[PDB]
């Protein structure tokens, strides 16, 4: 149990944490020191997205931590076996409190995980921590609290169920160089530590306006809302734009991505009202034809397989293709073929520009020109 660093010890989040996924790295960017809720219904790909975030840090100097609270023991063993399969386990701490174990261990599990994450933060390193279900922690605390006869409140949760998650997630922070010097007795100079969090919440029947989901939407710096309708229709990861947001925004992206993405999420919020209103017919049929062409081929574009992360270089030219209007020439069923071909094309022809964008944020009018010269030489030779 600890109190997070104060207002003067923090620093603003300025460094990207790449997951593998086109959807979140472009619409919902995450930065080192951010806290970013993953919220959705059950069997929606929450754990998939979280451990795909872990696996990807395998090679970027971020230590990862995975806290499983109230999960089935076999599922936890399966997760550990998958982390070991992809070589990520050597870089992760796994704290587990299975569905069988006393409610006090589930209640206290995520604080024990943050105590291990803060070791790297205070030493000027970076860490990433994943609370597997902070709904089940709230339930375990409600049990501990009702067994002590405390008067419950809304939905029978105790009065201080906000303070529970509040004092936890407020420890995921980025601390400036002076805090690291002072804490470490001057051993470490000029480095800023951080600890990124990805709490997972579970909602009944798509209700994001319940008590606890809204308590946590109010503590984190954004949320990724995974919608079960999109997930059943095959749109995976089922990121619902217009409910998902990132409160640090572009400041946490690379420059290239920050330029290419832009308003895309509000673009799809527009589109998803408009395609539900215009359920019958359309106007400016040509204009809305080339809108709900791309405002729909975006959704067809951002879907991605599991365990297939793609570097920032690969995501960047893809968002260029989509955003600059080059996909108005393609039918929906072709998009996946189109990307599958393009990402090999640029691994054959424009091989070094990929290496160049992977290192740097890399945006120039030179780069935009060269990135049109990339489109054209391919668009004419599929």
């Amino acid at each position: 149990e600890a109190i997070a660093p104060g207002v003067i010890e923090r620093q603003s989040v300025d460094q990207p944490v790449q997951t593998g996924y086109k959807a979140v790295d472009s619409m919902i960017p995450i930065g080192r020191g951010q806290r970013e809720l993953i919220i959705g219904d059950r069997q929606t790909g929450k754990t998939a997205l979280a451990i795909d975030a872990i696996i990807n840090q395998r090679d970027s100097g971020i230590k990862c931590i995975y806290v499983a609270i109230g999960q089935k023991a076999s599922t936890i063993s399966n997760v550990v076996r998958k982390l070991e399969e992809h070589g990520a386990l050597a870089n992760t701490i796994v704290v587990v409190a299975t569905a069988s174990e006393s409610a006090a261990l589930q209640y206290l599990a995520p604080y024990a995980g943050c105590a291990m994450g803060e070791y790297f933060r205070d030493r000027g390193e970076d860490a990433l921590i994943i609370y597997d279900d902070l709904s089940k922690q709230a339930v375990a605390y409600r049990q501990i609290s009702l067994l002590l006869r405390r008067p419950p409140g809304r939905e029978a949760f105790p009065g201080d169920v906000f303070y529970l998650h509040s004092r936890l997630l407020e420890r995921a922070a980025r601390v400036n160089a002076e805090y690291v010097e002072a804490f470490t007795k001057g051993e470490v100079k000029g480095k800023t530590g951080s600890l990124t969090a990805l709490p997972i919440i579970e909602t009944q029947a798509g209700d994001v306006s319940a008590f606890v989901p809204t308590n946590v939407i109010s503590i984190t710096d954004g949320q990724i809302f995974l919608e079960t309708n999109l997930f059943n229709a095959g749109i995976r990861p089922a990121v619902n734009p217009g409910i998902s947001v990132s409160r640090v925004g572009g400041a946490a992206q690379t420059k290239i991505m920050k330029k290419l993405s832009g308003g895309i999420r509000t673009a799809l919020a527009q589109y998803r009202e408009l395609a539900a209103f215009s359920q019958f017919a359309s106007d400016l049929d040509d204009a809305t034809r080339k809108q709900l062409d791309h405002g729909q081929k975006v959704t067809e574009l951002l879907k991605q397989k599991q365990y297939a992360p793609m570097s920032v270089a690969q995501q960047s030219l893809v968002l260029f293709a989509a955003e600059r209007g080059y996909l108005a020439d393609v039918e929906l069923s072709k998009i996946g073929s189109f990307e599958a071909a393009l990402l090999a094309y640029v691994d054959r022809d424009h091989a070094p520009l990929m290496q160049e964008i992977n290192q740097t944020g890399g945006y120039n009018d030179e780069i935009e020109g060269k990135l049109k010269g990339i489109l054209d030489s391919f668009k004419a030779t599929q």
Binding site: E85, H86, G87, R348
Partner: protein
């Protein structure tokens, strides 16, 4: 213009023989590089399995 008709009849069939040539040459190359990627992947997933 009888022979303008002859001219177009020569030209467009020449062009068919050309476009329906390059389409198939291009798809053959696509198939070549797809079966290349197949090996580049299969022999790389092996490393994963033996490290595991």
């Amino acid at each position: 213009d009888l022979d303008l008709a002859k001219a177009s009849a020569t030209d467009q069939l020449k062009k068919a023989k050309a476009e329906a040539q390059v389409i198939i040459e291009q798809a053959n190359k696509r198939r070549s590089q797809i079966l290349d990627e197949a090996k580049a992947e299969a022999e790389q997933e092996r490393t994963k399995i033996v490290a595991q």
